Amino acid sequence: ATTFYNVFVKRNSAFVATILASAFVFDMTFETAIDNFWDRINAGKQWKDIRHKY
Amino acid sequence: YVKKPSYKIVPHFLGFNIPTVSKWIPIFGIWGAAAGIGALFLIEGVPRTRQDILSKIPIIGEHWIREIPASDNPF
Amino acid sequence: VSPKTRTSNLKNGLTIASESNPLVQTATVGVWIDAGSRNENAYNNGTAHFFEHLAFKGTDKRSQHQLELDIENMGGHLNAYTSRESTVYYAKSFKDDVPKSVEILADILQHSKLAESAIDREREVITRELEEVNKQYEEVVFDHLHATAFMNQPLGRTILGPRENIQTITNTELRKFITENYTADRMVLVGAGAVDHDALVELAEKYFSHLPSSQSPVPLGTPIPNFVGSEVRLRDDTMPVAHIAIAVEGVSWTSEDYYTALVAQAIIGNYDRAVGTSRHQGSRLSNIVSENNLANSFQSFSTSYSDTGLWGIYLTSENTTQIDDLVHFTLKEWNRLSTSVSNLQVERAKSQLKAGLLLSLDGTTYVAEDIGRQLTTLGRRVTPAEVEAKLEAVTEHDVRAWAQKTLYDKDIALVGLGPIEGLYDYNRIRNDMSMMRW
Amino acid sequence: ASITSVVKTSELILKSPLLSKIVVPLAKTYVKFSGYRQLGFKMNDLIIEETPNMQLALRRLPPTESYDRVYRLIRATQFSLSHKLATGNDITKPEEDDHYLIPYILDVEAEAFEKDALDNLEVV
Amino acid sequence: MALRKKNSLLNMANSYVLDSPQPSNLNYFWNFGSLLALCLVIQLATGITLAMHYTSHASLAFDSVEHIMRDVNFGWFIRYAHANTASFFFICIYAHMGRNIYYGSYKTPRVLPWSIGVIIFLLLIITAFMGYVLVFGQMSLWGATVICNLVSAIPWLGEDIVHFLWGGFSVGNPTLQRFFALHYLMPFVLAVFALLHLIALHTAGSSNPLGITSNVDKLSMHPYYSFKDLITVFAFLLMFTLFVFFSPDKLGHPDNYIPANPMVTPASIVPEWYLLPFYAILRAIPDKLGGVIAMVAAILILLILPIVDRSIIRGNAFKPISKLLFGFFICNFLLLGVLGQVHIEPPFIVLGQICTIFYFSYFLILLPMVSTIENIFFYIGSL
Amino acid sequence: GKSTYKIPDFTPYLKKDRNTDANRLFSYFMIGSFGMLSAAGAKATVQDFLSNMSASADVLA
Ligand code: HEM
Ligand code: HEM
Ligand SMILES: CCCCCCCCCCCCO[C@@H]1O[C@H](CO)[C@@H](O[C@H]2O[C@H](CO)[C@@H](O)[C@H](O)[C@H]2O)[C@H](O)[C@H]1O
Ligand SMILES: CCCCCCCCCCCCO[C@@H]1O[C@H](CO)[C@@H](O[C@H]2O[C@H](CO)[C@@H](O)[C@H](O)[C@H]2O)[C@H](O)[C@H]1O
């Protein structure tokens, strides 16, 4: 907790760098998660689900 | 017995000296990383950024290698 | 090189400590006690201060008047003060009046009457003291500062105590306090100036030998304080000068960072517009404040107790539209102890302190106060050679590391008194404890 | 540039016999063609004043020098707006072109520069 | 207390146009600021009116401008006023900048109004360039093509940026429609920056031609400078009248009366006259990216005048050598302009390179040297 | 009600572990998360919005 504070939080330069890196990770993972969830709740309905017939 | 105080003037310019600036060198480094991460994040959607930078990152890089099937592409 | 401090014990556990100066003709002998207001609870808060008044109100032998005469005849004077952790009772006299003075001190401490009639008389005098401290602005500020920093804890209580206690303090609770606290293992008999150590030890064996010892003798200067970031605003638009104190939790007497905290305090330093040299001081804050007329004065402090401390600054200003600038620039100078200080500032402050710690001791009372304070807080007098070595061990890395854990982005206790409309709210002050650029 | 700089470099030139022999006549012609004397100014009236150091030097002028400088600025302003030149006693003669301000600004700057140096001292 | 001082809104106007304390000796070169404000007001009035009749679609743009000329009542006047005032705007802005450079208006304590001024100048260039494309004649198209292709020089991403600006693979309808939206916006941004540089100036006040303080002798802005501004307003309106009514196309290129044709390339593709010196600077450097950097640096280098001018005295009125150097600098700037519109042929290729070197060496070498020496001549010469 | 050295009761609000690094770190985790979603939201907003200026579907056709 002290260690974590000292490395990532105490210096604002480090804090902002950590926030931006986390935003990058969040953005990429959230995209993938939503895409999969969207595909499950709308299963059989989307073009990708019927494409194979054609 | 001491006749005179013992000191030197360190080189300075615009109120900066090397001892002080040296303490901030690492901070410029981290700010540069922050600016780099942020810039790259801003242009992550640009196709060239994916093609040239992001897809080349080991393991992770396959996140940015995505092909539209030829059947689904009007263009 | 100053003469060696000699130290002896009695059987009860009373320490005798002396430092002779064959160049002076006066002597300060007295009793330093490792006890003070902090030893009271909430119900008897004010007792230690009450006792200090009664100590001079007559003993089993000498009445109030006889006491007065005896001291008058000695030729010197007696003095006492009670603090949160320390009580002192000393006598300044002529070289050959030392046996009289030791005898009077031993009498007023061990054999005081504490007569109901005198309790009742002082009960009014002390009640009047509650309405006249109000004028001593620095003391008002520091007492509120302790009250808020150590909210609802023993260090947070005042020395005078509440009005309610003053009306209900009995001779019973006075006697109980001094019986529990003024024990031989907590007391040091100190002599400085024209005193012989061996003479003083004999006088101690004569007068202080029948002192109670405590059941469980802990070492001298033995104590958990939980600092509260907080503020007290005592706005008074009719006052022309604003008085502001800002402090963080500091270091105890025996902290490993004790010298690092002193060096950091010396980097900010003091300032007073009325002193001629103050416009030329090296301190950055001093330069900002003097160039911009932001303050009449400021004084950095690093107060220590047995188990905590307060480190901070006390400011006075008539510039009521730029209090914000004054506070802003002060806290930005503190930020630089974490971000920017180098060997340049650190070596300059060490130079100034190596002399400062010796300069302070320029009279027998100052020497006695130094022996007494060190013996009751550390258990020993630290030689100037050891002090020079501990100061030399402070590096710029130590200062930055200390400031990063003690100052940087930490809660402050803040007290403002007077025309402080321009002092911003807690958040805006506390936001200056860090720098977004770093 | 600082007045200190200008004064020191000028003194180096005035020391060297060769250099002074060639620079002093040029400087005198320059001043004649400059033509500030034809608006009744002294050279020091032209120095930029909107600086902390210069404001402090001006505050240290003796009252008489200060009141006369105010008049020369007002008079020159009136010649400027009228598109006229000074005549007669309003023209600054070479012997009246005294460096009234230079000593004050050199003292202000001496302290300012010493303060900068001493802010950078390193205990040895 | 008078209402003009008591009411906060009135007092803002009062502080800038009425009680504003001015030096009593401003000469006529202090009138370009109000002429620039006049040009800006004319461009807003005529520009918004043209927007009521213009169509930004590439199939209709050029014809909508002909409709304005032929069918809209007084459309010819509104169009020619807008087109000619764009040139007058640049004459006044060069005069205002030349005044500022000669009189040391960039020196402390006026660095901030000068620096915001440099941005105003960049916004005016962008505004005028986009407005010229809107006609969609041959010069409109081909000028947009070559100027927008300079962005291709930006390393790595340059080509992508160009396609992004165009909204396609060449200058076409998407580019024209976006240039219309931005051309409408940019004058409002320019007005905000013009206001910012005045607010920044208000802390020191106007400089004056002697370079000394005016705190000793102030005049109200009104009535003195109000009435002195009317003289140059009417002089400007006379010049405006002679171009707009008697020679409306003197400052233009005939090729812009031919509809844009991506196939046929015009004989010579040149920017409007006011951009010509920067174009000559770009041609001087053989490298594409080098040329673009030089061209931008030629404007941004104005930001270093506060540093490279080492004089202890503000302005050139009393500095004969600085006055000569300034004369050569200005004439060189005009020669660069001329060289921007000659053909890339001998001997103009080398001459353009020499003039480019002179342009930069003014800021980097000559002004620092001359200002150093003049400091010494003032000191020694008056001992 | 009269003495100003008797601090009013703040026990309903005061945290016991107020001086600890864990205490500060928690509040900065909230601030940091908020800053992180604001960064991710700004990036998404800017990217989707500015893409309007890239070649439209009819142009790419
Ligand atoms: C600083 C202000 C402005 C400048 C320097 C400027 C400059 C120009 C230029 C150079 C042209 C090409 C003129 C031609 O040759 O036909 C033009 C065209 C145009 N401008 Fe502006 N303009 C400005 C403000 C405005 C404003 C505020 C509008 C509001 C929409 C606007 C609308 C137009 C329109 C519609 C055209 C195309 C019709 C035409 O060519 O006349 N302009 N502008
Ligand atoms: C829309 C364009 C502009 C307008 C409307 C404008 C307007 C004005 C006005 C009204 C003044 C005060 C009167 C005067 O001295 O003439 C002024 C002063 C000034 N302007 Fe501008 N300006 C513009 C562009 C620029 C540019 C491009 C620069 C610099 C590159 C600039 C730099 C300054 C400076 C330094 C002053 C102070 C000059 C002094 O009084 O000594 N301005 N401007
Ligand atoms: C030129 C276009 C005309 C419109 C004016 C521009 C609108 C924007 C102006 C407001 C920006 C704030 O501008 C600021 O206003 C206040 C009061 O108005 C001025 O204040 C000044 O005038 C008032 C009285 O007139 C005095 O109390 C004050 O001592 C003086 O500094 C500032 O010098 C000016 O910098
Ligand atoms: C200063 C900021 C820096 C420059 C700003 C960059 C501007 C343009 C960046 C990329 C814009 C286009 O970048 C592109 O964005 C869209 C989302 O908008 C993404 O497209 C993704 O989502 C959209 C809808 O959200 C879907 O229709 C699409 O099938 C999917 O791939 C692309 O994966 C990305 O390649």
Side-chain angles (χ1 to χ4, degrees), chain B residues 49-62:
Chain B
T49 310
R50 313 181 156 183
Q51 182 64 63
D52 297 350
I53 306 313
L54 291 178
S55 64
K56 303 309 193 33
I57 301 163
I59 309 145
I60 295 155
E62 283 133 64

Side-chain angles (χ1 to χ4, degrees), chain E residues 30 33 36-37 89 93 96-97 99-100 105 114 117-118 120-121 197-198 201 206-207:
Chain E
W30 267 255
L36 286 164
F89 216 141
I93 215 161
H96 185 74
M97 292 159 74
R99 179 291 308 270
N100 296 333
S105 303
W114 165 255
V118 172
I120 294 166
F121 177 65
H197 100 308
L198 290 191
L201 181 63
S206 297
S207 186

Side-chain angles (χ1 to χ4, degrees), chain E residues 358-375:
Chain E
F358 184 74
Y359 177 91
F360 282 99
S361 75
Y362 174 82
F363 300 89
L364 292 164
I365 300 157
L366 299 175
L367 181 60
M369 280 326 278
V370 159
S371 62
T372 294
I373 288 158
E374 289 177 312
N375 286 337

